[model samples]
Target: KLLITIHDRKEFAKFEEERARAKWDTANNPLYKEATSTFTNITYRGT
Candidate 1:
């Protein structure tokens, strides 16, 4: 716990605030190897 002081002031506060806590917690995001590796949506319409 000796290094706690270096990061104890909540340095991640900025990133922690930019999020919707409730929604952020309950989410299913694909990592680099799960279902995709950097992917986007696809729209297949009438040919």
Candidate 2:
């Protein structure tokens, strides 16, 4: 299990913003098409 302890709202916001930016970049980057496809095709194994 992941234990995420966010001490401040700003820190959490920054982390979320960066992750959103990365997702946007990945969706647009042509070079990552295959990798992104592979990521999207993955099946999650729930614990």
Candidate 3:
């Protein structure tokens, strides 16, 4: 059996700050924006 835990409080605090920054950066990422955009996929059929 294996378990994961955070044993370093200082490292964990730093990681939390890094995570917040990355999340903010990701929100403005072009590729991520395009992938999540509402109009990225469309189909049209006409007769």
Candidate 4:
């Protein structure tokens, strides 16, 4: 089991924003995008 605590609702909102921004940042990176697509293609061919 694991436990997490949020002192206030505002902090939770901020955390959500941070994760969203990180996701967007990674998706916009060309290398990350190419790597992801290549991985998918290899898996598809493997199967």
lDDT of each: 0.33, 0.41, 0.38, 0.42
Clashing pairs in 3: none
Candidate 4 residue-wise lDDT, 1-47, digit = tens: 11232233234534563575477756533443333554665542211
Model 1 segments beyond 4 Å from truth?
1-10, 20-47
lDDT (Cα, tens digit) per residue for candidate 2, span 5-40: 333323553456456547775553343333345465
Error of 4 at 15 (Å): 0.8
Per-model TM-score versus the true fold: 0.19, 0.24, 0.21, 0.23
TM-score of 4: 0.23
Better of 2 and 3 by lDDT: 2
C-alpha RMSD by candidate, in order: 15.1, 9.0, 14.4, 11.2
lDDT for 17 in candidate 4 is 39
The local distance difference test score of model 3 is 0.38
1-47: candidate 1 lDDT, tens digit per residue:
62563253235432452363335533422231122333453231100
Q: Write the per-residue lDDT of candidate 3 for residues 1-47, one digit (tens) a residue.
A: 11222233234533653565477756533333333354645341100
lDDT value for candidate 4?
A: 0.42
In model 4, the runs with Cα more than 4 Å from the true position are: 1-9, 25-47
Instruction: Please give the distance, in angstroms, between residue 29's alpha carbon in candidate 4 and its true position after superposition.
Output: 17
Worst 10 residues of 1 by lDDT: 26-35
